[PDB]
Design a protein around this ligand. Structure first.
Ligand SMILES: Nc1ncnc2c1ncn2[C@@H]1O[C@H](COP(=O)(O)OP(=O)(O)O)[C@@H](O)[C@H]1O
Lengths: 243, 53, 99, 53
């Protein structure tokens, strides 16, 4: 009980995974609010994948599963990945595939030598997939050796159109989910979280006011607005019309 | 002797066979993997002294 | 040099025509075997393995249906199809005609 | 009985055999179904080659 867990994000230099910085605190999962039940569905799918290794090994299939998250920037994709990795006590292996430093062989070697009990995150997947620079090499490397066990890979893109349907396939990207702009429940839950204890009707009115004012409001913009009126809920509510 | 690997095997066999051993000693397996996942398990072996099986 | 001892070497090719008969010789490639497309027994055993416990007649009907639908079906394609209907044998059987 | 065996695949870099990755779980033989008796024939031939040096 005296020990607080930490999430260690691994970076890759050359062709080896290295500890980037020092261990970081675990962001609570409920802090990142995605949608009505997207977080619950993803957590349940990951729990099923992790807690049932017998199913894959007995049927002679690689114990590898991958998820793709697509949505507008600033919707909380990477934050959700970090929260999930903290919840599962795994470690993050961040890899910016948009960088041209690594090639197909280097990417395959990095994905093969990934640390155990670790989540590999591939951000900006849409960028390099349009264009060392390769698009088929990435999917060929993805279908290579599935690590030691449980090669959970997370890939995030701002848009899914630049990708191809071949990416979404069993043995590859398995459960794609769309995280988008905030909803009424999203806004009221954010207001309840940032300000610990107020009138729920006030939160509902706040959510309705922002929904009326903006249609494509992002949760990052909501957090930035909340930072302006830190420890000031009434002022923020009165200043919604300003936004 | 303790150097031989049959020592631990025999102790484990004894604690598996004679389940009702009133006198016992503990062996805690502690390993902190990467990302700080602490795994612990208590393994019990017969305590030093004389035991009858 | 044949290593220290028991230098068991395995070599795999998509086709044997591009090779030469000199490769197949004692002191060299010893037992060549041809692994090809699935058969009735192959398909029914795969169905029994992937789904742990169903009607054997259902597995036989599944195997016959895939044999009728495709002639050069590969076991990798069979596994990929089974992944589409994981934990869903009845749906997979009803969806054989889709394949 | 408490130990599960693993298969270690070796890769070659330069002119030396190196341990590629970490040890992997043993896929059951019956999981891979080849044909009527091809697996049995290959297993028997390998057993004869190994057990009669
Ligand atoms: N759904 C959400 N719930 C809570 N906070 C969020 C959410 N989305 C974004 N944020 C906040 O916005 C800030 C910026 O997030 P950002 O790095 O843009 O996420 P991403 O890059 O995954 O879109 C973060 O500090 C995060 O706390």
């Amino acid at each position: 009980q005296q020990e607080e867990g930490k999430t260690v994000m691994y970076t890759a230099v050359g062709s080896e995974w290295r500890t980037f910085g020092y261990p970081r605190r675990r962001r609570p999962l409920d802090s990142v609010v995605l949608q009505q039940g997207l977080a619950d569905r993803i957590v349940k799918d990951i729990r099923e994948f992790i807690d049932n290794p017998k199913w894959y090994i007995d049927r002679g299939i690689p114990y590898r599963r991958g998820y793709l998250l697509y949505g507008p920037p600033g919707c909380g994709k990477s934050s959700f990945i970090t929260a999930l990795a903290g919840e599962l006590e795994h470690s993050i292996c961040l890899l910016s595939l948009t960088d041209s430093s690594l090639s197909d062989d280097r990417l395959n070697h990095l994905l093969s030598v990934a640390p155990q009990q670790s989540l590999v995150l591939l951000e900006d997947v849409d960028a390099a997939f349009l264009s060392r620079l390769t698009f088929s090499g990435l999917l060929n490397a993805l279908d290579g050796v599935a690590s030691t066990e449980a090669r959970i890979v997370f890939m995030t893109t701002n848009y899914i159109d630049r990708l191809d349907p071949a990416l979404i396939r069993p043995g590859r990207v398995d459960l794609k989910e769309y995280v988008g702009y905030c909803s009424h429940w999203q806004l009221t839950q954010m207001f309840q979280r940032f300000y610990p204890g107020q009138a729920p009707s006030l939160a509902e009115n706040f959510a309705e006011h922002v929904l009326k004012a903006t249609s494509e409001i992002s949760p990052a913009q909501v957090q930035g607005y909340f930072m302006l009126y830190k420890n000031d809920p009434m002022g923020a509510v009165h200043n919604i019309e300003s936004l | 002797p303790a150097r031989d690997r049959s020592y631990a095997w025999l102790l484990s066999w004894l604690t598996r066979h004679s389940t009702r051993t009133q006198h016992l000693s503990v062996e805690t397996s502690y390993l902190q993997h990467e990302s700080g996942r602490i795994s612990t398990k208590f393994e019990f072996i017969p305590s030093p002294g004389n035991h009858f099986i």
